[PDB]
Design a binder for these strands. Structure first.
Lengths: 538, 94, 538, 94
RNA sequence: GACCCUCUUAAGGUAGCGUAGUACCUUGUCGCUUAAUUGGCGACUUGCAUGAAUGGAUCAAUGAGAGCCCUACUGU
RNA sequence: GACCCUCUUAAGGUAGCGUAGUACCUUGUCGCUUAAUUGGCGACUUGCAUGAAUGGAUCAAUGAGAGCCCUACUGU
């Protein structure tokens, strides 16, 4: 039950109706300032805080109020005698509902210098208190901080009669949380403006325990973020499939990031094992792409996280049949397809993400370094300047041939000779990796050809054209483009690249001997552009 | 160039003619089918996007008058394109 | 100057002295509740809050007052009309010094069920207000939430005369932050106990702008957690060295982890490169230790960073001389080594950690999976049971070898085949790894065996003994211990290892066909003990 | 078994006899040297930790009476052990 | 009063400290300390003429060292 | 009133909902709504005799459908 209500809301959004409701249910509205005004200008009678405390008015709009000795009435039980009596004293009131929101703090920057004085000036002192006080009342007073919960409240009251304990709880907690946020802001800003030591608070609310961890005794627990952002695991639905775990989330996110670097347009897919997107593809109709990645990795594969860029269809669903996948991400799905997989399989952690084909909404990452939390500015910028120095230059199409590395070598582990090369009519997928091992060259030393040709192998083996293995491989190996990581160390390594007939490496420029990198590229004939964007993903 | 796509207006699409009737799922299905059918379709005779549906399964090119039989809501179907590509692969082989 | 002192410090530490100090310079002490007594007993004359804010007080211990236009006095600018106005009124005081800490929130599960009632009824409400009010005064009034800095304040006052902007600033910032801390707790607990969500509120102080990240423009800061457990990159001692990048920090984590994973023990180190175990072995001095962990790595090497448990001196710094090293993590450090490294190769980022070797101190770890963050427990579990299902069990010598791997392999990015083999009886060393290769068998193909033999080669030739390579290997070819993640997939793969003689493999418990795998290693007699640890470290 | 190692008492060690004199660095050096010299040292004749310093460079075993010349503050030095191991390697080789 | 040039007849003061036991102007300006202080301390500092083993800054403990202040004490 | 057994002559109610248009006892107990309510709504629920296409729960919009309440209105 609510008998009196203190509506000192900074943000007035929708207070008029809440007020109307309460009044219609008798609830006297004891409010002051902005609110009070709006209410008396909207045909809602409202008593002023003057007829409660012994405190007039000054700078209405933030503080001007508080309640000593007396807050202890609403406190943690506005009916608990010892508690109760304090708030109501002499003409004071036994308000059983207080709604106090706080305008979000902001410093900004003026034309003549940070407006520190006024900006800081407006730190609500009354409000927050009223909140904490009321809030503590896990019983009696029903605190209404967040403005987007006047409905729920009203409905409950209009019906039931008494805001249930459950509700009271939720509300109170939320209020405390709101004040927490407020203070946090007050910290971050000030620590960045006034002094220099900056403080970064994190956004990890609503928790959920998973299975365990890397081992059975390594319990992990996903903590969702309240942020509305955009594409994120927090907003994905496990249609069917046993509860995803640590590894699950991890790789799934890496996959998402991979497919999100290519930004809409061209159909694309991906896959991944042990935090390694080992199968990006673009192409046209998914079908091909999908399987092309499965060719990319036909070993490990079994139990990866397919991450397509749109809805999955039966065509490749029948291809997926038998080829065990851990999780299948997708912006949406088709009924028959979904059903099909669902019933046939018994393990696929189908986790299509509702609407992921838009803006990610984040630009920072937080690598936990046992007492450290960095804030890398999310950037995938293909190149800073396209300046092929080597005598052999890249024509626009060979340019794309190269660009595809950047496109994936970023969105996947580095120290990998990413051989993004043609495979589908005017659509280039990454062919070979490097599997991030010791020296940069070590990548090619046990990859490049290693993967490129394993793939070629499977393809050839299957369709056995007249072009015997040697010239078969050559078919594309002579035109291959490798834009491996950033600036590839020296020159004989690049020679090894040319060795594999790939007369098209790509190197951002500026390693141990850039002049020699050029010299060699000229000699060999390795066309390589000096992009400058080291793709590693830190 | 298009309508006033308000902060909330991008869901109903052509199914806004149905109001609050028939359910979100069927409204979405019908809207998606309408979008796919109203998308431009390239004429296989003149190679320009002037193929529009003249009836249930009949499609006509506004430029060259090329009229043909296709899908009910799509001028070209995946099965038909698969058949065409199979025969093209055979013809290339021989 | 500062002539009034409202000190209602929940925590009654330091107040005695502070109060006397004040009384000496003058500064009327207007405290109440607890403080009042303690001081008026120690001797320090104290006036009760009763005769300031219009109406008295209530339930001493937390509540006290909460008066609007009295908190607005202290608030900010007690000398600027509008604001100052609330520090005068009707006997209303213009208090200029406030120090009121907040006893931390707690839940204290009672023998008869969680004391939620009391808990909630002990969340200080009065405190936070007074505090945040005073705090607000970046100008005039000075607030000292933290009790552990009464000295600094007193000092300044005594000497200088009036407090300094610099100080007032820090004081305020800190006070707000403290109230934040309070709120945070009030949310977290109550959000788990009352409701059932786990709000993870984190704060990383000591923000230090660094180099970058992936991009040369990927600005990120090494926000230093204020955790005072033990081993912490933040609280380091960079003898000399440019600001180390994200990369360095991370690999620092890596090596710190591995080195401490081995429980230090007989002179051990942990060389690390491209966040992949690049060295791990024990010894009787760092001479051997160092080279026992550098030995197994003839590839990556150059560009790595040492993480030790004893002392790095010029003795082994001779071989080191040239061998490119980015960072040093020496608990103890020799002056001459220090000096040499200093000039020698500038690169040496000498980031010794003051007696780094302790117990980690934290129990959790995080991985910001962009859209959330997990909470993986600080587990150090090294084995379940020690028992070879295969009849032929481990001799103490090879048990020690296994025990060895356990540590490294557990602190080694997995999907590999960790082949640590004895370099010096009792003092082990790594001989293989396998950075996330497709299938475990492919890993043993392009890692373990290969790197083991190449190592053996490097060793044999380097130190040229009588015994010729082939037999030099022969001697311990089987002895070679490899735990590798967990259960090696099948038996034929284990037999491939036996092909490379390697008749000593560790296999936790639960392989893809344990039944068979056992049979096989039993017939072969391969000492295949069943540790049980699904280390599978990523 | 040892002293009352208080919350703050574990720094001075045997250099607590110097009070606040001589500086933390030299106090630490002297304390570490004292700890190393007072550590148990195994007798090369009876293989038990009974070797104590009798003078500047003289070390004696309390059990078997084996007395020898070693380091000033350590019974065995790294250079001497290196020489011994070199000659042992030669002797094994031949 | 930053920044290209200079005058550069080798170079043109880095970290710090600063009216100093170094500051002529000088009892420099401001704040605390006093009723009032060429004082002491703190800050600022246009440094006549500070500055890194001609060692710079700083400093717990120690001092029959040199100043200023509070308390107690008193024929000072 | 959880848990091993039963009686199990196939099995022994999962998700939900619950005094229901289903609840005999019954005008069930409590809270709002009234001065007062076998009423309505909400919660609890020991379900005589709820429960998943004998479809369960829920529901925006729609309704000459069925109840209860507020306001306005009035010879009801």
């Amino acid at each position: 039950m609510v008998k009196r209500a203190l509506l000192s809301v900074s943000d007035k959004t929708g207070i008029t109706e809440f007020a109307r409701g309460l009044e219609a249910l008798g609830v006297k509205i004891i409010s002051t300032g902005g609110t009070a005004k709006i209410l008396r200008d909207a045909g809602i009678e409202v008593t002023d805080v003057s007829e409660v405390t012994g405190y007039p008015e000054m700078m209405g709009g933030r503080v001007k109020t508080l309640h000593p000795r007396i807050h202890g009435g609403l406190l943690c039980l506005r009916e608990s005698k010892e508690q109760m009596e304090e708030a109501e004293k002499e003409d004071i009131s036994l308000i059983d509902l207080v709604a106090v929101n706080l305008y979000p703090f902001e410093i900004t920057i003026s034309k003549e210098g940070v407006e520190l004085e006024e900006a800081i000036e407006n730190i609500d002192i009354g409000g927050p208190t009223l909140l904490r006080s009321a809030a503590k009342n896990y019983r009696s007073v029903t605190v209404i901080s967040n403005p987007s919960d006047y409905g729920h409240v009203l409905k409950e009251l209009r019906s039931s009669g008494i805001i249930s304990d459950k509700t009271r709880a939720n509300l109170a907690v939320k209020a405390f949380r709101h004040t927490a946020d407020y203070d946090a802001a007050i910290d971050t800003y000030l620590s960045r403006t006034l002094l220099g030591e900056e403080v970064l608070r994190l956004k990890f609310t609503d928790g959920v325990k998973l299975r365990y961890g890397e081992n059975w005794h390594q319990s992990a627990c996903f903590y969702k973020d309240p942020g509305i952002e955009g594409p994120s695991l927090a907003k994905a639905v496990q249609l069917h499939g046993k509860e995803l775990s640590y590894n699950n989330y991890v790789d799934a996110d890496n996959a998402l990031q991979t497919v999100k670097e290519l930004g809409n347009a061209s159909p694309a897919v991906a896959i991944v094992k042990h935090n390694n997107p080992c199968g990006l593809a673009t192409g046209d109709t998914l079908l091909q792409a999908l399987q092309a990645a499965w060719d990319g990795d036909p070993i490990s594969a079994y139990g990866s996280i397919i991450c397509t860029n749109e809805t999955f269809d039966l065509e490749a669903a029948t291809f997926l049949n038998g080829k065990f996948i851990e999780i299948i991400l997708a912006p949406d799905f088709k009924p028959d397809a979904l059903e099909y997989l669902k019933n046939k399989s018994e393990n696929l952690r189908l986790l299509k993400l509702p609407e992921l084909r838009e803006v990610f909404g984040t630009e920072y990452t937080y690598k936990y370094v046992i007492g450290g939390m960095l804030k890398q500015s999310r950037d995938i910028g293909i190149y800073d300047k396209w300046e092929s120095v080597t005598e052999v230059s890249y024509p626009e199409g060979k340019r794309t041939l190269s660009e595809f590395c950047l496109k994936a070598c970023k969105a996947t582990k580095s120290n990998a000779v990413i051989l993004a090369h043609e495979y589908e009519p005017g659509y280039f997928m990454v062919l070979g990796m490097g599997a991030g091992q010791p020296n940069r060259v070590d990548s090619i030393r046990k990859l490049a050809a290693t993967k490129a040709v394993e793939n070629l192998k499977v393809i050839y083996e299957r369709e056995q054209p007249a072009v015997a293995f040697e010239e078969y491989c050559q078919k594309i190996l002579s035109e291959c483009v490798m834009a491996s990581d950033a600036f590839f160390p020296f020159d004989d390594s690049v020679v090894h690249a040319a060795e594999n007939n790939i007369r098209y490496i790509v190197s951002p420029g500026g390693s141990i001997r850039d002049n020699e990198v050029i010299a060699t590229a000229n000699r060999l004939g390795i066309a390589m552009v000096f992009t400058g964007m080291r793709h590693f993903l830190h | 160039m298009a309508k006033k796509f308000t902060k909330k207006g991008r869901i109903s699409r052509s199914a806004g003619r149905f109001g609050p009737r028939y359910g979100r799922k069927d409204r979405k299905l019908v809207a998606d089918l309408e979008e796919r059918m109203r998308a431009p379709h390239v004429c296989t005779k003149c190679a320009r996007p002037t193929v529009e549906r003249i009836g249930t399964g009949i499609w006509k090119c506004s430029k060259c008058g090329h009229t043909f039989a296709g899908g009910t809501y799509i001028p070209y179907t995946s099965v038909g394109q698969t058949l065409l590509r199979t025969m093209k692969n055979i013809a290339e082989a021989k």
